[PDB]
Every structure is written in structure tokens, then in C-alpha cells.
């Protein structure tokens, strides 16, 4: 049965993970993260999101492709950091590397990059050129990717050891300082080197902050991710008073200013979508949530974040004519941009870990287990998501310490 009484212990202390999947009544359950990975990773065009990449007929490494029906394939720094996350947990090294290889080599910005803002910080957007070469399209960070880089590399370093091809501490540490001098304001985690007050929800990871700062061997340095963790947490629950009841209506954002409150509209060039849209960035908020809760404990705020959000999903379904909750909100409308589909039911599945209402449990989790792998010119966001979800749910996501 589902564990509707979340420990404020986490698994990071106690040892304990819970296996929320198993909590749930489900069987074949490391059968199904195994498959996942294995059609993720495999040569199967089909659920397929790992690829090869070569010049003139020489293997270099890999990426995960971020297919793009309208604006053309192109490769990202979260999915690519996504992807590394998910192969250190199952033990999945030669994948693992070739990722790596690849960012370090095609994704990370050269540390004398003439704008000091870039230097060292990986480039959101690339894609293969005409002839099939790789090349930067954006050489602006995505801010959560390299946050994931240095989980990915510091677990990597704790599993495997530090003397094959990759130094993994060292790298993971070279990306903490980046993400320290580069990618953050006061902090909090940034949205942009180049825009002031101004952090992305989805971007904010506790735990992994506080893993951070068991991982370095400075006093300094090791206050200071404590001091990001505690702020993470102020911000996101700053964030959910904001968005709760009238008018945002509990369910969180893509943009925020740094005491939690919504970005309104548009505020830069080049803008994706109104920041006080719940929209793709904003559906990992709860995920988020739900994983702090996991690894470093329950608390009050975490059970009413994910409590009101998946609250207002399920209401929101009500009032819909297609019966699903929608995959963008804004002050509560639908923006009929489309019935949820796996990446965000895989979000909001991991949230549970925060929940404290076993109907609502039953209801998300069963809408996530029940769906087939994604497949189709949609499944980098959303087969990137089912698949740390997958590892979520089946007490597969965990922190692996660095021994000093």
C-alpha cells in the first residue's frame, strides 16, 4: 500500500529508499526500469533517444537526441545530463562515458571563451549541420543541465573510481565551480548569466545541493552548497505560497524572481513562453519536490505543494472535454496546448514521494504505469522524463557518496 506518511528522514540519511512502484502493488518491476533503458539506449529508432555520433566514419561518442518534428533535431544539454544521470544509477558506464565525452568535448563553452559569462558553461542547443558535423546553435546555457552534470559525475566518480578515461571527480568539481561563478546569483540557481533576479523553478534541486556539499573537501565550499540547498527550499516554498489559491491556482511556474514570485508575462527576447506559465520547465517542479522529499525528508511544505498540485491537475481534468489534465495552464485556463502526456504523468508520478492522499496516489501512479515507453517525434521530453521517473519509482534514484 501506498505510503501516504512520507518520512521526514530521508534516504540519504537513513539509507532507506523507498520503492514507491512495489508500495503500490506492481510486480516485473526492475524488469520494466531495465527495458526502459535498454530500448532508451538501444539502436531501435523507435524508443530510441541515445546516438552515435561520428566524423567521416570515426566514432566520437554520444548524444541524446532531442527530436524536433517542426524545428529540426537538435541535441540539449538537459536531456544529455538526463541521460548520464540515468545511466550511472543502473551501473550503465560505457553510456555514461559517451555522453560525457560528448558534452565535454562539443557542449562545454572553451574556458577562454571572449565573453567571461560563457566560459566553461555548456551550450543549450546544438545540432549536426548539413554534412552531418556538430555545432553550437546557442551557445547559452540551459542552467539545469549542468546541475545534473555534476550529479551524474560526482555519483560517477563514487560507483566507478577516477582512473579510466574520465577523471569524474574533477570534472564534477570543475562543474560546481562553474555552476558557482557562472550560474548563479545570491545563491539561487539562474535562469541567465545575463539577466539579474531571475531563476527557473524547475532548476531547483535540494538535495542535490546538499549532496553537493558532501562531496567537496572545503570547509567554504561545503557551507556554501549547504546555504544553496536551504535556499533552494526558501525559494520553491516561496514559490508555492505565490502560486497558491487565486490567481495562479497551485500549480507552479516556468520563471520566478528570487522571492518566489512569478514572472508575469514576457521580460526578455528571445522568451519561449509567458513566465507565469505552468509549461514544460514548470512540470518538473513537483518531480522536484517529490525527490527532495525522498532523499533528504518530508516536510510540511513539500506534502502541500504536491498535495494543492496534483489537486488542481485532477480538478482541471474534471473540467475538461478530452477527460486529461492539459500540459500548459495559466492562472489556472488551459492553454489547450494538449492532453498531458508521458513526460509530465512521469513527473507528477515522482511527486508522489511528497504526497499524503493515497486516492490521488493511486490515480497518478496508475495513469504512469500503466502507459507503454514514449516512441514517436515527441519522446525526447517525454521518454527523457518517463525514464527518470521509472528510476524514481522503483527505489533505483540514489546518492552515491564520494569516500575521502
Known amino acids: ?18 520503492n514507491l512502484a512495489q508500495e503500490m502493488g506492481k510486480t516485473n518491476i526492475q524488469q520494466k526500469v531495465n527495458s526502459t533503458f535498454d530500448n532508451m539506449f538501444g539502436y531501435n529508432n523507435t524508443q530510441q533517444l541515445y546516438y552515435p555520433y561520428t566524423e567521416n566514419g570515426v566514432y566520437k ?32 558506464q560505457e553510456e555514461f562515458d559517451n555522453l560525457w565525452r560528448f558534452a565535454k568535448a562539443y557542449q562545454k563553452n572553451p574556458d577562454n571563451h571572449p565573453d567571461a559569462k560563457k566560459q566553461g558553461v555548456y551550450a543549450w542547443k546544438l545540432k549536426l ?27 560517477a566518480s563514487a560507483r566507478w573510481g577516477n582512473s579510466g578515461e574520465f577523471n569524474y571527480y574533477n570534472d564534477a568539481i570543475t562543474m560546481l565551480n ?3 561563478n557562472k550560474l548563479m546569483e545570491n545563491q539561487i540557481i539562474r535562469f541567465s548569466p545575463y539577466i539579474d533576479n531571475l531563476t527557473d523553478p524547475s532548476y531547483h534541486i535540494p538535495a542535490f545541493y546538499d549532496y553537493f556539499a558532501n562531496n567537496v573537501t572545503n570547509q567554504a565550499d561545503k557551507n556554501y552548497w549547504r546555504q544553496v540547498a536551504t535556499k533552494s527550499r526558501t525559494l520553491l516554498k516561496n514559490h508555492f505560497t505565490k502560486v497558491s489559491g487565486s490567481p495562479h491556482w497551485n500549480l507552479p511556474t516556468f520563471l520566478s524572481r528570487l522571492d518566489g514570485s512569478p514572472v508575469i508575462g514576457y521580460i526578455f527576447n528571445g522568451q519561449a513562453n509567458p513566465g507565469q506559465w505552468y509549461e514544460f520547465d514548470a512540470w518538473r517542479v513537483i518531480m522536484n519536490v517529490g525527490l527532495d522529499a525522498h532523499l533528504m525528508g518530508a516536510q510540511a511544505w513539500h506534502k502541500s505543494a504536491v498535495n494543492k498540485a496534483l489537486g488542481f491537475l485532477s480538478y482541471a481534468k474534471t473540467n475538461n472535454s478530452k477527460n486529461c489534465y492539459e500540459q500548459v495552464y495559466s492562472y489556472g485556463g488551459a492553454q489547450n496546448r494538449g492532453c498531458a502526456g508521458e513526460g509530465q504523468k512521469a513527473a507528477n508520478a515522482v511527486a508522489l514521494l511528497a504526497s499524503t492522499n493515497a486516492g490521488q496516489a493511486n490515480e497518478f501512479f496508475n495513469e504512469f504505469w500503466s502507459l507503454s515507453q514514449p516512441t514517436g517525434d515527441y519522446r525526447y521530453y517525454n521518454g527523457s522524463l518517463y525514464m527518470l521517473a521509472m528510476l524514481h519509482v522503483s527505489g533505483n534514484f540514489k546518492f552515491y557518496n564520494n569516500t575521502f
Open 129 to 155: 549541420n548539413q554534412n552531418g558535423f556538430v555545432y553550437k546553435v546557442d551557445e547559452g546555457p540551459a542552467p539545469d543541465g549542468e546541475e545534473y552534470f555534476a550529479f551524474a559525475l560526482l555519483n
Open 1 to 18: 500500500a501506498f505510503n501516504n506518511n512520507p518520512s521526514s528522514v530521508g534516504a540519504y540519511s537513513s539509507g532507506t529508499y523507498r
Open 178 to 180: 562553474t555552476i558557482k
Open 61 to 92: 561518442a554520444h548524444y541524446i537526441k532531442a527530436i524536433n518534428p517542426d524545428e529540426g533535431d537538435d541535441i540539449r544539454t538537459e536531456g544529455q545530463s538526463w541521460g548520464m544521470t540515468a545511466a550511472v544509477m543502473l551501473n550503465k
